[PDB]
Symmetry: D2
Subunit: 445 residues, 4 copies
């Protein structure tokens, strides 16, 4: 009535209840109906959220994701649960089981990737396990033994197959691989995607989320599915993709996350006495991608830019991805201060009409801003979590705390939505999103 | 390491995670392996624990229990889950599906009852629902519409078939119906139970809990199962039980709980405009059983006594059941003060060697005291919860708070055991007991 | 910026800081500039707020107040601080030092009384002290040893000198004795006060609080100050007041507080082995003022009425004092349900325009309602505290909890105002009021 | 009885109460009787603890200290309260009023300095003020307007007059300037101090703290007081101290604090548009003292060493000051990992007999260890605070969190002692120390 908000203990109870309720056994769905399968970076956040509840079950979540790793090392962005429809495109549309020589043996997966936040999840699992004493340390350490090789292959595939020219930036062949499907970041590269004879299909996402203003448009889905056809024609071969894909972009946010991930995994590798050549490689990649992100930045404002490889041009947009260099470090001192002024100013977290001091996915003063439409404007708790966690790693303890405080205040209604209207705070999209529950559990401690 | 305790937010997350993890779908198991079925007063506590998480799912728990209600109104103490063994005695041993004319149609149940804390669970569901606004009120109110008649039949069967002589005390035909299976309260009535040709059996409880000191003895289980044979020979007929049962005791704690339950249900009946004749009946029974409890009490100390109907004599023991009149009210002023001095003194919560200021199931200075052996000594969070909740109803706000505080401190290790060693605090019995998680969730708010 | 509220630990620290900052040494000012002396029922609340900080200093607050008790047992409503100016009427205007035979020696006080919340403060000090160990328990028990007799004289003076006809209601000779200076309760009685030659004077209160809408009018002060002249003319003699005072009312809210206080003090006397004759007297007065309160009640709603002794007529007004019977008990069951419906419904706590679910001092739908004007409408935390504490004592734990919760939400701006606009929540009157900080400290525990 | 600890809100309220109770008006005593004056780095911590209570009063604390700054820029380590006795050496013994050309007018102070934590307090005040709205931000920014120049003079006096050879390490002329009076760090330097005709005196400190084991010896005080004679003989002249002082050491912990403070103050100067030349100087000193600290470090463990300027030899001792490089950064990566292993391992935080996971002032396995004797072993909350705050600044959020958490667990008895027995946790020295209450308030947020 007068106050729909939950106390911190009630909120944490409700978050954990949701995470257990989305558990199919060995995998957690990203959202009950909209996303009834295991998604890659959702799964990393799910492991973070499970680590305060059960280190064993947190490890099981990453074990399950890594059992779907491709033979070349790629972690695919969807691992389908057996016998669940209601999500399109499903395994039949991707047909990776048929066409992809590198697809895993006893798992149905997608044929594209997603950002490598997994090392961050490993770090949080270990930190939790170190507070719970010997028996629980052993579980976390036995996981390292079993899966260090697989994490290395994941990072090595990113470093070697998606950074072919050693530019220190990750090439994507689908906007879906960025995690920000309809970000304004990809508008001009999608504008050069002309579909051919695209086999018939029926959207399923917008039977669940029926507001047209909160999901991508039909025109946008026709480009998304057409790119799948181009990958399928080359049997998802890494070598042939540069030659065929109509969409090839260097994703500076994905690159900054990879840089952080390598640094984190390198430190884990040192503390647990993993092979020295692996630690050296991880430190090498963290520096290469840190430098690769810095090379994209505006020399005045520090804002990071994506790069359209096909058009051979810098993509200038006003989204939250501009702040990638804040995550990984590396900017000159003056350029970083300017970048923090942009973050805190009226074009983003300082905008006067925002309900919370949180980072909007697109700047509200940008011509591309749409307050309800997914990544074109709404506020995402997963960005809040990622920025706050990276900010604290930079030593910016008070910036990290303020983002955490406002994220808890936004989440304190218990909707656990993936994104929120930035002016009114209305939950948008699907409720019961596992990784919002995870972020809340991590923040509450 | 230095401190295995969880923060209040971590504890509440872990409690809710456990409650969701014990959910089979429509019922919650009392404990994963030891009690892999739905138990009656555990189920009431489970509903209390679920009400802060989901009023819908809390209502579903009570709906499921009430679907197993017998045709005469009795709520049986076990509702078996389909296809689960590992618990003895199971449905085949009870054979209620064959023999009991009143057994429910499409449910396997036991053939005995357990204390009526269910109205208390209904009260907590309603109080939660009133803080969550219109949609959630409707769910709680629609439950009242569907199940008020069934709750009335439950209370009426207790009042009419287990208080045949209108003495205002509940007769039990099995120590299991008290919830305190091996309490010293029943030793002398069990001593007059001589088993006959008792069909062969194998205990299953002590394959799971293998410490012999924490479960009842083999000699005690032979009496428990022999009483089942006596009920089976009369096909669980209410009319014939007084004529055949070797164990017939008036349980003063069960009676005090019934008195409170009637009072609570009567107030619910008034606030939601249920039939006036039902409210009148409930108030009648609450007073009759309040008086029935007071009639058992020592005129000096106020301690309540059980009554062995067969031996026709008062049972004097030093267990927590002595404090039944504190729950329901009714004692003269001086007698109640004396009873509170007994509770707070060195024979119970004031005993110098107790780790927490909590109520031991048997007095530590009693000859019957056994520090590890189930109801002969250990501390049970479910008694802590019940006393604290009833104390606050009496207006004893600070006594209730102190019991709550110490219960949270004991539970703060996250074992969620049903009972604890009273001197060392060691968790005993089964971990992951649903109703300890429920008590914690209720207390934390 | 985005969130003006403090966290619970920040709020608690700011409340304790305010209380120590208003400490003059052995007495706490009620407010820094508006009320720069010790007020009697503020000092009871200050004692409650000091108890979690220092039992020694809480006892000192009450010792200081009781050292200013009159020879006939009356506790005056102001104890003036040595040398302090800026409040009118000051010691010069009261002239109790010269005129009042019963006034204390070497303490300057006023010449009227105020409600007897003091036993409640004594209970909260004892409950705090029992959690703190032996030396702290000794401090509290030595305070009882030396002031029990003074507390009895206080209650005996009320029962014998302000209830001379043993009606079980307290007569007041000044609206300031009710604690609700300008309440609509007193308007018709004040209409019969006709000042004669009133010696001139300048207000001090509205030089500090200069908004005219938040304090009484000049016309009201003329009547307040004339009643002082009438008392002085008979040198504050108890026996002469009924024959000379133009204001003589029975205060049912004061009477219900006294009923509760007698019962509280009686229970203390039993627990700490005080003279049996004293405890009997206290229980006798508890019951008599309970009956006196209930005798006033509306036959349909159970609402309590004040009584004008000179006019011999019931005073019907729509203020929070109507709910007096909820505090002390005594209504038949159906009338108490009606009275709680009145409290929770749209004339009081459930009015739709109210920011908080709290009790306005006057009904927002009464024609006497004024949203800014002191006791004519604003929400007072002291009343929130009293009802919540009294409701918990009645055993209405959820109702007490909801009041506490809204009270803390209102106070979380750290204003510590004594009253608040009911619709906007704007803090009114003086900031830095000790008894609001005290309420907050008691609630946060 | 069963649980001596306070809840977080009770702890916070008791800390704020202590801080206001030690407030003399415009300065806070360090301790009520032991240290009844303003100490310089306590006053920085007091300012940190006041910031969540009152930004205005926090600023006043720093204004009062800076009004006692010497004409050459030095902040003296004691500012004496007008008319206050009971601490020796008092203003008479220092005689700075008569002898010291640079001493302030109309403030009595000591004649030595103390570590420069003050910029850290300024940062915490600014961070608090930015969360509180415009008028509060104006208070903090007006404080910078009027004291920025004084803060620069402070840092410039340290860099130019106590680092005359631009070695990037601060020279001390008295162990009291380190803040660690009787630390084993200084024993070999104090062995070269040979008192001549020392004017007689009586200790005041051990009349308050009478256990001989918790304070320095008479022999140590004879040396402390002789160094005062040497300073007075040259009238506290900076230029003459190197030629006459028998104690001259480079304090690496002080130097690392100064490095951090310069960098903090430089960032403030950038954010608030202070003169660019000032910010350049601050970053220059930050780097120079960082390098000076690292130059001292053990080549295997990275542990920092103090330097005895008269003996020209590195001082190797096993105290917490060895961890200075963790505060300011600068170690190569592999040496910092070794130093953190030393900190967390069995010689310091991981010693098995330690009650809390906190940093003992001397290693429990060193032969200089004494568990009760001031800086020779006990655990100090101020060090816990400094390392946690500095660790968070390095980006080691989990390490900073674990220190905070153990610090709060140690403080939860409400003793507010300045140091604690490391094995039993017994509070030692004076209770009611302001800077421990300050630490607690900052941690609880």
């Amino acid at each position: 009535p007068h106050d729909p908000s939950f106390t911190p203990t009630q909120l944490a109870a409700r978050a954990a209840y949701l995470l257990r309720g989305n558990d199919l056994g060995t995998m957690t769905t990203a959202a009950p109906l909209l996303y009834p399968h295991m998604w890659s970076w959702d799964a990393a956040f799910v492991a973070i959220g499970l680590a305060p509840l059960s280190v064993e079950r947190a490890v099981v979540e990453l074990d399950t994701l890594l059992s779907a790793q491709w033979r070349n090392g790629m972690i695919p962005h969807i691992v389908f649960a057996n016998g669940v429809d209601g999500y399109f495109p499903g395994p039949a549309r991707w047909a990776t089981a048929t066409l992809a020589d590198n697809a895993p043996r006893n798992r149905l997966t997608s044929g594209i990737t997603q950002p490598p936040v997994h090392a961050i999840a490993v770090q949080r699992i270990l930190e939790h396990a170190r507070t719970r004493g010997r028996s629980t340390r052993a579980v976390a350490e036995a996981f390292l033994d079993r899966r260090w090789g697989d994490l290395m292959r994941w990072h090595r595939w990113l470093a070697e197959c998606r950074d072919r020219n050693e530019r220190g930036r990750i090439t994507l062949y689908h906007g879906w691989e960025s995690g920000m499907d309809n970000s304004p970041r990809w508008d001009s590269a999608y504008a050069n995607v002309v579909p051919g004879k695209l086999p018939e299909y029926q959207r399923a996402d917008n039977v669940i989320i029926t507001d047209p203003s909160q999901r991508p448009s039909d025109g946008e889905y026709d480009r998304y599915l057409w790119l799948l056809e181009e990958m399928k024609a080359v049997r998802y071969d890494d070598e042939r993709l540069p030659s065929v894909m109509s969409f090839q972009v260097e994703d500076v946010f994905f690159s900054a996350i990879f840089s952080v991930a390598c640094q984190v995994l390198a430190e884990i590798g040192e503390d647990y006495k993993r092979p020295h050549a692996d630690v050296k490689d991880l430190y090498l990649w963290a520096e290469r991608f840190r430098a690769g992100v810095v090379e994209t930045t505006d020399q005045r404002t520090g804002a990071a830019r994506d790069f359209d490889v096909l058009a051979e041009k810098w993509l200038v947009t006003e989204t939250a991805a501009q702040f990638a260099p804040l995550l990984c470090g590396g900017l000159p001192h003056d350029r970083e201060r300017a970048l923090l002024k942009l973050l805190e100013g009226p074009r983003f977290c300082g905008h006067p009409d925002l309900k919370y001091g949180l980072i909007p996915s697109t700047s509200p003063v940008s011509r591309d801003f749409r307050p309800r439409e997914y990544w074109r404007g709404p506020v995402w708790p997963v960005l809040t979590w990622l920025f706050s966690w990276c900010f604290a790693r930079r030593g910016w303890a008070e910036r990290a705390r303020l983002l955490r405080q406002e994220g808890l205040r936004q989440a304190s209604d218990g909707s656990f939505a993936a994104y929120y209207e930035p002016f009114t705070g209305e939950p948008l999209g699907s409720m019961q999103q596992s990784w919002t529950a995870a972020a809340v559990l991590d923040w509450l401690g």
